[PDB]
Amino acid sequence: SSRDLLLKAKENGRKSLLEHEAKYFISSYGIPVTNIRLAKSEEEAVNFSREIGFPVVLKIVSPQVVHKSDVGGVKVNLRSEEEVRKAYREIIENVKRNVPNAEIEGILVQEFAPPGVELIIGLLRDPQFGPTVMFGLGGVFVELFRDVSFRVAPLSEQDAESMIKEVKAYKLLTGFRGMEPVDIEAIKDALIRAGRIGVENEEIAEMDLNPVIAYPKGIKVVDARIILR
Amino acid sequence: SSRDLLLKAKENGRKSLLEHEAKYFISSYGIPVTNIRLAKSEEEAVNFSREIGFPVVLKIVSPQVVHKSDVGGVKVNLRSEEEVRKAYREIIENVKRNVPNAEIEGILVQEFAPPGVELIIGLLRDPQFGPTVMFGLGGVFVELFRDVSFRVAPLSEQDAESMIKEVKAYKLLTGFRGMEPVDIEAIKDALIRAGRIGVENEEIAEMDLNPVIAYPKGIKVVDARIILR
Amino acid sequence: MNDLERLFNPSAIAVVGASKDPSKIGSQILRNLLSYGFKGKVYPINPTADELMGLKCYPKVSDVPDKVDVAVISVPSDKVLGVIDDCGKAGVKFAVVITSGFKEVGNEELEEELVRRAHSYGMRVLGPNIFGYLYAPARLNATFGPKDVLSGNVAFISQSGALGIALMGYTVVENIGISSIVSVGNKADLDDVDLLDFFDKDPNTGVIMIYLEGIAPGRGRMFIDVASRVSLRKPIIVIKAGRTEVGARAAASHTGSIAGSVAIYESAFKQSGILMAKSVEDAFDWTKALSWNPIPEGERLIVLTNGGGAGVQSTDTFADNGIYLSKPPESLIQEIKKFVPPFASFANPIDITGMAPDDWYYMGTLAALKNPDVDALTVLYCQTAVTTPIGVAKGIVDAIKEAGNSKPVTVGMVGGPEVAEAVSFLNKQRIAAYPTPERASSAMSALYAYARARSYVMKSLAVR
Amino acid sequence: MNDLERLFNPSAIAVVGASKDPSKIGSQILRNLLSYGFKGKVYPINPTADELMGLKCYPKVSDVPDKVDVAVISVPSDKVLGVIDDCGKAGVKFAVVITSGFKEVGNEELEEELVRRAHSYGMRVLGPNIFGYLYAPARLNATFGPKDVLSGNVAFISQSGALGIALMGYTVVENIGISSIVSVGNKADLDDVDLLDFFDKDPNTGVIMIYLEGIAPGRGRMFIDVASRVSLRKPIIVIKAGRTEVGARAAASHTGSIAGSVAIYESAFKQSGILMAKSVEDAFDWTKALSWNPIPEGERLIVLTNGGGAGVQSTDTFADNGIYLSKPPESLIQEIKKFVPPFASFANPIDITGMAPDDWYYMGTLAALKNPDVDALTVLYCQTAVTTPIGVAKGIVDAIKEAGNSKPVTVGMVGGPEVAEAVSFLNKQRIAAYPTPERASSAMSALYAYARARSYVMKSLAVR
Ligand SMILES: Nc1ncnc2c1ncn2[C@@H]1O[C@H](COP(=O)(O)OP(=O)(O)O)[C@@H](O)[C@H]1O
Ligand SMILES: Nc1ncnc2c1ncn2[C@@H]1O[C@H](COP(=O)(O)OP(=O)(O)O)[C@@H](O)[C@H]1O
Ligand SMILES: Nc1ncnc2c1ncn2[C@@H]1O[C@H](COP(=O)(O)OP(=O)(O)O)[C@@H](O)[C@H]1O
Ligand SMILES: Nc1ncnc2c1ncn2[C@@H]1O[C@H](COP(=O)(O)OP(=O)(O)O)[C@@H](O)[C@H]1O
Ligand SMILES: [Mg+2]
Ligand SMILES: [Mg+2]
Ligand SMILES: [Mg+2]
Ligand SMILES: [Mg+2]
User: Which first-to-last residue range defines the signal peptide (chains A, B) (predicted)?
Assistant: First the structure.
């Protein structure tokens, strides 16, 4: 069961899931994620990169790194074996540099997701209303303008659809200069499933799917955090 | 007098200024523009490019082409003499192909503006209130969300400052993820001068400064349109 | 413990804290109970008095030779627990604890113990820190507020004591018919969800208005489940206190609580089909319209006016509420052209011009209401030299009668004292009337807002 | 031609269109002129009558052996130009053209000719298509509206005839003291800008309220120049019709005009220091407060309440208006602690609790007002058994008198019929009182909004 991931983390005194664990978990609920081969050395990192197909991304897997870019731990758009080894050692050195004592599980290999419209799907627990799903457009729109909608879980299709149309930046999903409309049904589906995750898994305190990239067809969660209690 | 630019155009039955004419005109009012030189030969184009300093951008100058990009008349980020001659000839050909009957005034050579925060400064004439200045953040923020403020001219500093703080995307000017704060005093000053242009020049029906790029220090009008009546 | 039938419809009620002193709260409650006409048994409880208000008095509830359903407790806070124990041993089902000085002043432990003890006897608690409750169908006024309310179908619940008891009085001035007043105060035990369950099943209650500051942790999901289902048949209006970050923070500071989420409360109300009012006047204005009208069955709303200005005010106000007017049906236009001058306007609002006499309001209203392609009507009147306000009002009443159907109607009348009287006349006959065009339009908007809220809920309940 | 002194303060007025028929508009106007007490000469004009209402009548204005300043013209549209010529011959300065049926019904050329002819005689036109005008300091009621208004310092201008004449009556119900009523209607000649110029210089006028749909092309710049200067000393409230895109488009269709820019009008009003009202109620509520109070001199606004609930409604409402409360001065807190219970709250709002008797309102209000670190006061009252509404009101009045200063005050009272009467009592003494806490707070917010608007204008006029 995917719950084994939660039980393991609990057993190890960890209060959150590692990136690959989080993605595996939400994937088991039908939310689309990136490929996640966990590499233990430069060698498999390259085998994984080829196996996966270029371009790829490398990330540090460590309980100690929660903000990966800010430690020089993320290397994106790697399209050659040379560039993979190049980024591999470069990451390890950056984390060994900024947090010298770090618990390293490996380096996560994943496909470089092509550009689209970025989204945020959140899950929190409100003292009054319990598990609550949050939606917003990525980047400055949530981070800076706080443009977000909320629905208390479980979500009906009516809840999912209306909360999407509710945010001020909604038109970024229905086609604008240089960008086609994106798959709103896929977004609705992910929102409902996020709600279900919150209702069923009482040990999940918080979930942050950010960024989620939306395309004319389908979506792909690129980064995922799950906080435990 | 820069007014000669308006009278000449009028004398030729032209209902708008060419790019270089518009930029010359607003520059004469103290609004910063990209450095520009009108090139009449591939040779003059290279000399002007060296003078202005690389990188440069080349644009077609013709009364018949009003949307320069949609015909392959605009070439940006040219960093060598070779790259300049390369863009020069393909513009001549791209326009000769798509607009065979075009009056060639020249090819405008101009400095390549580095990225910053984009703005729109507008001027229109309201039936009731006459010349009115418009402000907004560039890109989707005006184009898609219509997030704009208005002040009737002439503008006081109080008008200029308050209208900037009024727009919903204001926080894009005061520092956010990956971007320093920009020069708001320069924006205020440009808005005021835009107002003065509208008050004084009765034959100017419309003005569109778009995009305007704002930096931690100063701003630069990259494209400017001026419609006559 | 979850059925409130015998709270609102008891056979026997005890009043603990009544005395020969009429200024005492307990004494005021006993007085209201008798004046308002309660038909069951009333048992004044007092240590020394053998008789109060001509009724046999007892020292303790447990001495009463009867089964007491409800005990209204008005003794000092330090005596309440004792009374609770006695009421418990006596088999009392409901303890209505008037008395203040519990969690709201910092004494959380006392309050929790009060509920614990009541529950150990299978007894529920209302409050504490409340001014009582009223149920008109049982001729039951167990408050120390006003002695009377207008009878009707509106149930009003208030978390606030002073504002609640004041608003109880204000319902009379605003001609709002009441089925129940319930002061819930500290909400230590019985809360909004429990009350909504009762009013759901109450054939006497058609509309529920709630002054709400907050609800208990872990109670919200159930609140939505119950409120959304109620909303399918009965509108719920919430006056939300702490609507703003500042106000919520103010309310959080005062109790030391963590501030409730403004955004998530708003979403919860949407999922509940609840209409959130930002003020007393909006809440009351809407409650009138919802109490006295069916929901519109479509979007063919007609505005009728003897003045362009009032019509534009109405159009702007409807627009603010997401309500947009369409061209009237050709049949209605032709009907009205029979008596109207050539320079009248039929864009909707239908402008019958300022020279319109009283009689055109009768004919226009009747024509509008009878038309099968009309779903609702807002009638606007500006007091002119050529008319009488009361005549216009009576024309509207007659038209509604003759139209004989039940389409929603609101009325806005502007003018001097004669308009004030005409508006009062309309409201006393349960026709929703207001002294400005914007309020009449906001009232009609509430009817459409409820229709849309109900629709939101129905969709969210659709079977997969 | 630009000075309106002799429009509002004429020596002689002619009424054209009056007759022995009391139902004719001209006759109604003449009747109001005598009833309201005009002290100058009145000249009824009628072809046959030798006498009307005991005044010598003439067939023509030019026959009058006097200089007629103002001619109020109420004859059919096809006769108006003739009367204009005669008035021109008589040297008349102002033609007040009551008569309808000009541009508003499509006859644009006639309207333009009317103005052309009047100008050829050095004569100005008010209207056409108006119900007249009233100027209280000249005891001049040249309307066919209500015969009387309460005297005061508010000038009310209306582009709308029906809504305007109705609102003229409504000022009485709302206890608003009036200095002038001006119906401007079609605005063919004299308009808002001209009137604002007069009221600027009028010591009788302290507040100007305007119902406005639109202004003429090319008139906006001048509107801002004049309105901003007026705003430095006198608040201007505009009830803007067509303030929504839908409403502006609606008003544009009706007149065939181009739809006014919503956003740019809003900016023009901001640059003018004007307060835009979204409704009649807001405009009237704000006008009361601005009429009867000076501007607050700082941000130290105190809210005083006998109920937490009312206080939170107030806090939320102030917040919606960009008004945030600060801790009261320690001096004020200690003063109030002398009579207040321990569980009172002093966060601001100052909560003197629901147990507060009448006299605590006297003491609290007096303490607040006298305190040198208090700039303004909003007093909130919820009717309890423990108080009397009239007692609270009289306590407030006594406190205001004794404080002896004129710091802005608004009052919100919630309750039954006794509160209705107490609120009426307060307003009749020019103390701004309302039946809800939100309205009292919106009224106080208008005082601060004007202060901020005036400041906007001053800043924009700063010398380089
Ligand atoms: N697999 C991927 N495909 C495409 N872009 C990616 C991918 N992983 C990360 N990114 C981009 O790189 C950014 C930084 O990576 P991220 O996983 O968010 O780390 P962190 O948020 O901890 O700094 C993301 O916000 C996203 O824009
Ligand atoms: N000098 C320049 N520096 C930087 N970017 C430029 C420059 N000139 C043009 N651009 C960019 O190229 C875009 C297209 O060119 P533009 O001048 O707007 O022509 P047009 O709008 O007539 O097609 C501009 O909107 C701007 O984003
Ligand atoms: N400053 C305050 N902020 C928020 N709530 C407060 C404050 N002071 C008192 N309260 C009130 O405490 C109440 C709990 O019940 P109650 O005391 O009966 O109401 P009230 O104080 O209106 O009489 C809440 O309704 C809330 O309005
Ligand atoms: N529905 C309307 N929308 C916009 N302007 C209107 C409307 N009705 C009348 N007007 C305009 O209002 C002005 C005053 O005319 P009036 O007859 O007094 O209006 P009302 O119907 O409010 O009494 C005229 O210029 C007229 O064209
Ligand atoms: Mg991230
Ligand atoms: Mg461009
Ligand atoms: Mg009309
Ligand atoms: Mg209190």
Answer: none
B77 lines ligand 2 (CB under 6 A): no
Range of B68's domain? 35-112
Statement to judge: residues A81 and A141 lie in one domain: no
Neighbours of D3 (CB within 10 A): 12
Residue found under tokens 């002819």: D117
Question: Which among C254, C255, C280 is the best mutation to test ligand 3's pocket, defined by most ligand atoms within 8 Å of the CB?
Answer: C254
Q: How far apart are alpha carbons C365 and C426 in whole angstroms?
A: 15
Report D:193-252 residues touching B (Cβ under 8 A).
214-221, 223-224
Contact C105 D319 (CB under 8 A): no
> Is A222 an interface residue toward B (CB < 8 Å)?
no
Do B126 and B200 sit in the same domain of this protein?
yes
A84/A190 same-domain check: no
- Dihedral of CA atoms C111, C236, C180, C117 in degrees, nearest 10, equals -20
- Do A154 and A78 fall into the same domain? no
Residues B95 and B163 in one domain: no
Which residues keep their CB under 5 angstroms from ion ligand 6?
B 223
In this complex, whether C and D touch, counting 3 or more CB pairs under 8 angstroms, is yes
Contact A159 C224 (CB under 8 A): no
Pair (B81, B5) in one structural domain: no
Instruction: Give the separation between CA D248 and CA D255, rounded to whole angstroms.
Output: 11
- Sheet containing strand A37-39, edge to edge, reads A37-39, A106-111, A56-61, A74-78
Q: How many domains does chain B contain in total? A: 2
Q: Residue C97, class by beta-carbon neighbours within 10 Å (0-12 exposed, 13-18 middle, 19+ buried)?
A: buried
Which technique was used to obtain these atomic coordinates?
X-ray
Q: Which residues on D lie below 8 Å from B151 (Cβ)?
A: 267, 271
Q: Which of C264, C456, C462 has its CB closest to that of A129?
A: C264
B51 and B119 part of one domain: no
Contacting C residues, span 265-284, partner chain A, CB-CB under 8 Å: 265, 267-268, 271
The answer to whether B and C touch (≥3 CB pairs < 8 Å) is no
User: What pairing do the DSSP bridges indicate for beta strands D207-212 and C55-56?
Assistant: unpaired
Q: Is C40 left (phi over 0), alpha (psi -120 to 50) or beta?
A: beta
CA separation for the pair D407, C130 (Å, rounded): 36
Q: Which domains does chain D have, with CATH numbers?
A: 1-129 (3.40.50.720), 130-293 (3.40.50.261), 294-464 (3.40.50.261)
Q: What is the dihedral of CA A77, A83, A89, A94, to 10 degrees?
A: -40
CB D365 within 8 A of CB D339: no
Nearest to C261 by CA among A88, D259, A149, B171: A149
* Residues B30 and B87 occupy one common structural domain: no
Which residue owns the Cα nearest ligand 3 atom 24? C160
Residues A158, C261: C-beta atoms closer than 8 Å:
no
Residues in a beta bridge with B221: B33, B212
CATH of residue A107's domain is 3.30.1490.20
Q: Can you give the resolution of this entry in Å? A: 2.1
Decide which of B112, B130, B160 is a domain's last residue.
Answer: B112
Nearest ligand by distance to the CA of A19: 1
Which of A79, A112, A145 represents a domain boundary (last residue)? Answer: A112
Q: Is B61 in the pocket of ligand 2 (CB under 6 A)?
A: no
Nearest to A144 among B139, B140, B171 (CB): B171
Phi-psi category of residue D109: left, alpha or beta, with phi > 0 → left and psi -120 to 50 → alpha: alpha
d(CA B151, CA B138): 18
How far is the C-alpha of C30 from the C-alpha of C18, rounded, in Å?
Answer: 7
Q: Do A143 and B176 touch (CB under 8 A)?
A: yes
List chain A residues with CB under 8 Å of B171: 140, 144-145
Write out chain B residues lying below 8 Å of A168, CB-based. 145, 168
